[PDB]
Structures are given as C-alpha cells and as structure tokens.
Design a binder for this molecule. Structure first.
Ligand SMILES: *C(=O)CCCC[C@@H]1SC[C@@H]2NC(=O)N[C@@H]21
Ligand SMILES: *C(=O)CCCC[C@@H]1SC[C@@H]2NC(=O)N[C@@H]21
Lengths: 507, 507
C-alpha cells in the first residue's frame, strides 16, 4: 500500500465517522449527523475542515487497538462563512464513542477558539455529548478546563452562540452557561448534570428524561434556554437568520444592512393601542412589530418571564435590541425572573455596540413572600445595573405607567440615557393618585376634593416633563421616525468612565 | 501498603533520581548532580521544588514499564532566593534517561517560565542534555517549540541567564542563543548541534569533542559563550555574584546596593596612564579598575574580541555597564567581532535600565579584505544602532583617539548622549594630521609649514569642544567623581520616541 492510498482511506473513514449502522440509528432517531448539520449551517462550499487526521493518544484499556482509532476523534471543527461573513464552528459527533469528550477532542475545539479570538470571528457550537470519556480519566477534565478558560476569555470579544441538538451531561453543560445565547431543539435535546438514575438513587422522587432536562423545561421554567426550535433543519435555518443580526467582534459597530422600509413613515396604528382605562391591559407586542423594520422581530424566551419582552430587530438597517414590559401578564410588574432575563440581554447588547430601545409600562414590583424570600431586592438590582452601566445609545419610550422605583430601573433618563419620549397617556409618579392622596391628606376634611385636585394635576405626563425627565411628548404615530432619527445620530457617541479592573454587578 | 507509605517512597525515588550508580559516575566525572547544584546556587532553605511527582505519559517502546517511571522526569524545577531576591531556576538531571528532553520535561520548564514572567522574576537555567528523547518522537519537538516561544516572549521583560555545565546537543543548543548571557565550564561543557560522528560522515575532516564544541572554542573563537569557569563549584559561586548586578525585571531600576567607597574621591593614578606618544599603547583596564567602586569589575568574554572591553561594575552602589576600547590590541580598531560583542552587551543594558559608561580610544576600522569580505559594513552598523537606540543614561569619556566614522559609532553626543568628557590628550578628527594635510594641501609649495600649522590647530581636543561636541575637558583624576554626579541625576531621565511595532536592527 502506497502513502497516497493510505491517505485516501483515512479521508473516507473520517467522513464516515462511527460507521454506517450508527448513522442509521441517528437518522431513525430523527437527527442529522454532525457533518450534515454543518453543510446546512454554512454557505455552500465555504467550509474548511481542520485537523481531520487527529487521533487520540490514549493507549490504556485497549484504546491502543486499531478498532478504536477513529480519525476526527468525535468532533467536526473548522471555519466557513454565512452570507459571506466569516464564522468558526464546531459540531460534536455522537457516532464516535458516544460523542464523549477526550483530551484531543477539547484540543481541536480550543484551537479554533484561539483563531476566532485572534482574527475577531464569532464561534457557533452545536453540542451533543454524553459527557467525559472515562477511559482517559483526568485528561478529559483538563479538556473541560481549557475550553472553559477560552469561553471566559472570549466573553465581550466575540459573540458565542450555542445550539444544543441532543443530550448533554457532565461538565459539558457549563459551556452553554458561559456563551451568550443558548438554543435547544424541542423533544430532541436535553440538558442535565446527572441523569434520572442518580436523582432516584439520591432522593426518593420519580422523574423521566424529558422532565429532568427537557427543552420545554429549560425554555419555560428554569430560564436557561433562550428558544427551542421544532427540529434540526428548522433550528439551523433560524440560526442562520439570527446570525445575520450580530457583529463579528466587539470592535465592530452593529451591522447595517440594506433596507427598503422608509425610515420616515408614520404608524397610525399606534395611536389607539393604549387604552384610557387604567385597568385594561394591552399587548405590547403590537407596538414592537409596528415600529421595527418590515415588522420582523426576533423574540427571545417567548415562554419564560412573559411579563418582559426582549429581542432583536432592525431599524433603518441597523441591528437594535428591544426591551419592554408586557402589561398583558401580571399587570406588567417586575419580578425575579423578568429581572434576570432583562439584565442578561441588555449586557450582551451593550458589550457589542447594539443600541437599546426600551418600551416602559411598569406599575411596580410583584408583591408577596414568594418574591421577598427569593431575593427580589438582590435580583431587581441586576436590571438597574445592566442599564446604568451601558454606554451604547439608549432610547426610551414610556407608553402608560411608570410608578415607583421601577421608573428608574426601566432605563430612565437619569441613568445616562440619550432620549426619553412619553406618549400622551404616560404617567410618572411615586405611586398612583389613590395611595398618594390617602397618605398626603390624612385626617383632613373634604378629602374627595383633594383627590380630584391631585388627579387633575399629577395623573398625566406633565409633572415629570416640566422637570426635564422627558424630552418631548409625542404622538404615537410618529414614534418610529423619532427613534430612527436618534439612532442615526447617536451611533458615533462615545462616553468616558473611570478606570476599573472589572465590573462588580450585584449578582 | 498505605497511601502515605507510597508517597514517602515516591519522594525518596525523586531525590535519588537515576540511581546511585549513575550518581557515582557523575562524581567520578567531576560533576555535581542537578540537586546538589541547586543547593549551592540558592540561599539555604529558600528552594521550593514544584511538580516533583510528574511522570511521562509515553507508553510506547516499553516506556509503560514500571522500570522506566522516574518521578521528576529528568529536570529539577522550582523557585528560591539569592540574597533575599526571588529567582526561578531549573537544572537538567543527566542521570535519568541521559537528561534527554521529553514532552513533560519541557512542560515543567515552561510552567516556571510562565510564573517568572507573571511576577517579574529572573530565570536561571543550568543546562546538561544529550538532546531529544527519540522514544516519544515528535512530542519532544513540541517541547522545544514551547520553550523557544517562552524564551522569546520573556526577552526584555526578565533577564535570562544560562550556564552550561555539561554536553548539549540537538535543539537544546538554541535556548542559550535566546537568553541574555551564556556561561560555560572549562573542559566539562560542550555545545554543538551534531557530534563528531556526523561531521566525519558528512565531510572528510577529523575532529574530537573538545575541538568541535568545547568551552575554549566558544569563549575564544566563535564568540558564543560569555565566560568559562574552572569547575562546577566556582561556576556557581561566580554566578551568584553575577546575579547580584541585575534587576529582577525590566520594570525595575538598576539595583542600588550599600556602598562604602566615597563617591567624591580623586583618582590621581589616571593622569599619567595615557602616553603622549601616539604610537605607544596602554592598557584600558587600568582606567576601568580605578574608576569603579572598590575596584571590582566583572569582565565579559575576556578572551574574545580583545580589542573591545565590555562588562559590569558598580558606581556609588548602582549597577552600570561599561564599554571601552583596548588600544593594547590591534591599535584599538573596530572589526567585525568587536562590533558583535558590543551591540549585544549595550542592548541588554538598555533594556533593563542599566546606565552606560563608554571609554573611547579608537583610531578607525581594521582594514583589509578579511573584514570587507566578511561584511564589516553590515556588522559595524550593529554597534552604531545599539547606542543610537538607547534611552538609558550614557556617559562617554574620550581618552585619546577618535578618528573618522568610529567617533560616532562609539556613542558620541550626537546619538542623544547625556554627557561627554575629554581628557587633555583627546583628539577628534576625520583623520590624522598626516593624511589630512596631504589631501588638503596638494601640489602647493611649503607643505611642511602647512603641516606644522595644521597640527598646532587641530591635533588637540579644541576644534570639537568649541563646537559643542564635548561638554568639558577634565583632568583625568576627577573622572570618577564627575561620572558619579551624572549617574545620580540622570537616573530619573525619560525620553519620548515615536511608536513602532518593533525595532529593525541591521543584523
Ligand atoms: C391592591 O391594593 C394591590 C395593589 C398592587 C398594585 C401593584 S401590584 C405591584 C405594585 N406594587 C404595589 O404596591 N402596587 C403595584
Ligand atoms: C598605514 O598607512 C596604515 C594605516 C592604518 C591606520 C589605522 S588602521 C585602521 C584605521 N583605518 C585607517 O585608514 N587608518 C586607521
């Protein structure tokens, strides 16, 4: 056998992976293989695979046998482009040793992370594993340590996107916790530290795989996964479109893309969304959809902390992040869960120079022992900090209510905001007229007259505007045009801040 | 066997190394072991050994047998102090696998280099090896690559001192080429890429070990080793004293140490060293010894390029570097070899904030085809650059001759010097009076009168001094006091220079 023949056989084996019968199982299971997934993700013909001939060096427990020598060592790594833009990817291959992490496995992933940091290119990981490769022992633990170090170092330098498309257990579960966004695939992906076998052995509780770490749990109740997609093909199609929003590095401005939607059009549909009756809820999403370019909005965590809306959109071609209250759910009140989702989203957009638009309608905080015992004070400070720290353009629109300390938490002008607009129905106060009059006028005669006088003077947007809290009071139909104008002039804004070794968010 | 018993046996094996019989050979050979050498080098009780329990992971060619498992894997690494000052060291142990370099071998060395860079501590290596460990194959080549990368990265950050105390072959020979100073041990150390067996196989020439790569060759003819010491014990004793001159990092000022030698004393011995007869040589070393604190001078490469003197000394407690000509050898003329030694010494002292004192007495360059064919133009530019680039205090004293372009090469005031003094016998000119008059007065009558007129006006230190080339003309007896005064006021001097990615020395 010649050298060239050996090489050709090594290429064909790396392409097959764990063997055709294991591929057949993956397809029976409704899953794509690691190499098929890359072909869908990246532009045709743009993918360049690295280190395809790397094999493990472990010789213990029979691992020195030729029957265990799978070139590629369970990961596909390399670089490519999505719509002409450079991206680094890796995808874990479940057909070789179960997708378990070896020393060399982690290495290959680390090397492309080092290039991505060096050139300033994003990294997308497609995760699917069973955990560490116990046959090597502590080399897989060193593998995890090296990946974790890169994931932390890359934070704020390049965006890191993780899509989980299968099981995930052991140390693998912490890389999505270090990246910026985590997505899952409904009823196909799992994310858990230990399996149901350990849970039942430790505590006398019964649980199945879908209940312990299923995609529905992590997108609806734990707040870990940002969005689950129906299947592998739809998940990668939406991932490509999501990719188009983000810059390649934090040194880059928010991407600007060709846009046909006139920036100066009016939106008459906004003038009557907000009811005059204070106890009538409305859907904030109708406002978000009508303002954003071509009515396209990418919603993050649609099923978790529904009282606050966060997501991506484009206005006049430029990527922006949108945060707003949802009065339809829990009167639009802040709670622990909403503060966690908000702070994380805001922090990402600030780090990568993506402007923020805030739609405020918040009557206060959710009362009760469930929130007080949960540390609502500690968690609420997370959203206040996330806005106060921001140095990217911030445009706030107040649609109806902003009572109490929630006024400042939801990116008020006094946290170094750029512009703040009020709609005619906006009301800014420490509390509603009923509470304020009962406290201010206590024991006096003709309280009912005092109630009428207070409402006429303070139950509107004027006592705040005349003080400099609001820059203008605008007709809702003009909101989009007003925001577009601010975005196109604040984009070159820089501010100074004292030197710090690093930030100290309340956590 | 309990866990504690196993640990105690692992400690005793690491201390023994390659076994008592191999130690016996080392002592028969007149050599100390790697651990005995550290005890001599570092302050008693200050040494802390790291990673004493590390073993190789190679399982091929029988390397998995328990009989090959030597804890420490042929290197002693760790940290300590010399006179209270932190230093990182490693010493290669020849008794385990011949001192050959394994993957893990290089690792352990790299880890202490990473700490030394992080804290700002010097590194001293004691080298003794036979080359790569061929049983591992390409892992030892990766080992060399990682060491080389650290040695380059540390340059200009911490000083790196290498003492070779045994054979050195293969890739190992390049680490002393990356460090700042290389020392050897006479008739015990060797430094060669390939052995005499390869040389005789390639070319029809006979050579022995001492001729191919002996300490005498590298200190006298190739200019690679800075100084050879008689034996292992004397080599480490002089190394400790050398260590006391250098700062721990380039962020530190030149060390200042208690000194009893008055800074303002006169040195009458200098007034009559330089003869009035222009063709009478004198020994520059008598001037150097009489100026420096307590007449202590550390001479570098005493037997190579004897026409130029470089070394370390202290004036008023502060470490300084001294460069000067030696008129005793080749009239004090510059050549290829002298330019190489000078530029390297000057560059080190500048990088680590050690002031320079220059004693100039140079009639020009060595003529002939031996120098022209050797690239005297290219090599002479090395010393000119090394001085011109310097940003540390530079004090120049001109004792007798400075003709031609050599005037500027030997750190003239026009290369951003701080002070420049002339002795009464100094003469600065493009060329001597005889050549200048024959060229200026060609074909004229009464040339002999023109010769007398030229000598009376130009053959002294005045045509340069009246132009601003010399700051003062001083009596030699006051030289030391004048230099001490300049050093104590230039020490806080900083200059600005345009931004550069990196320097581009002519090479
Ligand atoms: C009736 O008195 C209940 C009042 C709750 C109104 C809302 S709920 C959360 C905010 N906190 C608060 O005190 N008022 C707001
Ligand atoms: C006799 O004419 C030889 C003159 C050499 C004098 C010295 S040697 C090196 C310098 N170069 C030079 O032209 N003169 C100096």
């Amino acid at each position: 056998t010649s050298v060239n023949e050996r090489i050709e056989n090594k290429r064909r084996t790396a392409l097959l992976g764990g063997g055709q019968r294991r591929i057949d199982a993956q397809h029976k299971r409704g899953k794509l293989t690691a190499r098929e997934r890359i072909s869908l993700l990246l532009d045709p013909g743009s993918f360049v695979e690295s280190d395809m001939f790397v094999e493990h060096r472990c010789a213990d427990f029979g691992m020195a046998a030729d029957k265990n020598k799978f070139p590629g060592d369970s990961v596909v790594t390399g670089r490519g482009r999505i719509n002409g833009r450079l991206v680094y990817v890796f995808s874990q291959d479940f057909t070789v040793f179960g997708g378990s992490l070896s020393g060399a496995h982690a290495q290959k992933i680390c090397k492309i992370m080092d290039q991505a940091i060096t050139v300033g290119a994003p990294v997308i990981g497609l995760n699917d594993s069973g955990g560490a490769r116990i046959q090597e022992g502590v080399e897989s633990l060193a593998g995890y340590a090296d990946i974790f170090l890169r994931n932390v170092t890359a934070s704020g330098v390049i965006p890191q996107i993780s899509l989980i498309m299968g099981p995930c257990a052991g140390g693998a579960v912490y890389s999505p916790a270090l990246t910026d966004f985590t997505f899952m695939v409904k009823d196909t992906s799992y994310l858990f530290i230990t399996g149901p076998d350990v849970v039942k052995s430790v505590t006398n509780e019964d649980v199945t795989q879908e209940e312990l770490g299923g995609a529905k749990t992590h997108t609806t109740m734990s707040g870990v996964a940002h969005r689950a997609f129906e299947n592998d093909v739809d998940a990668l199609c939406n991932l490509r479109d999501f990719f188009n929003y983000l810059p390649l590095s934090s040194q880059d401005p928010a991407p600007v893309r060709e846009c046909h939607d006139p920036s100066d059009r009016l939106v008459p549909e906004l003038d009557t969304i907000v009811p005059l009756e204070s106890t009538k809820a409305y859907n904030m999403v109708d406002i978000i959809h009508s303002v954003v370019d071509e009515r396209e909005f990418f919603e993050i965590m649609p099923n978790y902390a529904k009282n606050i809306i966060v997501g991506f959109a484009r206005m006049n071609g430029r990527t922006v992040g949108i945060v707003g209250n949802q009065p339809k759910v829990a009167s639009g009140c802040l709670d622990i869960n909403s503060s966690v989702k908000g702070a994380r989203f805001v922090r990402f957009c600030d780090a990568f120079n993506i402007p923020l638009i805030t739609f405020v309608d918040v009557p206060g905080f959710l009362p009760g022992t469930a929130q007080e015992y949960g540390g609502i004070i500690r968690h609420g400070a997370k959203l206040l900090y996330a806005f106060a720290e921001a140095t990217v353009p911030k445009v706030t629109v107040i649609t109806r209510k902003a009572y109490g300390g929630a006024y400042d938490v939801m990116s008020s002008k006094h946290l170094c905001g750029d512009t703040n607009y009020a709609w005619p129905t906006a009301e800014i106060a420490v509390m509603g007229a009923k509470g304020a009059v009962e406290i201010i006028f206590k024991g006096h005669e003709n309280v009912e007259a005092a109630q009428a006088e207070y409402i006429e003077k303070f139950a509107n947007p004027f006592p705040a505007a005349v003080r400099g809290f609001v820059d203008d009071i605008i007709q809702p139909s003009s909101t989009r045009a007003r925001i577009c104008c601010d975005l196109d002039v604040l984009a070159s804004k820089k501010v100074q801040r004292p030197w710090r070794k690093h930030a100290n968010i309340p956590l």
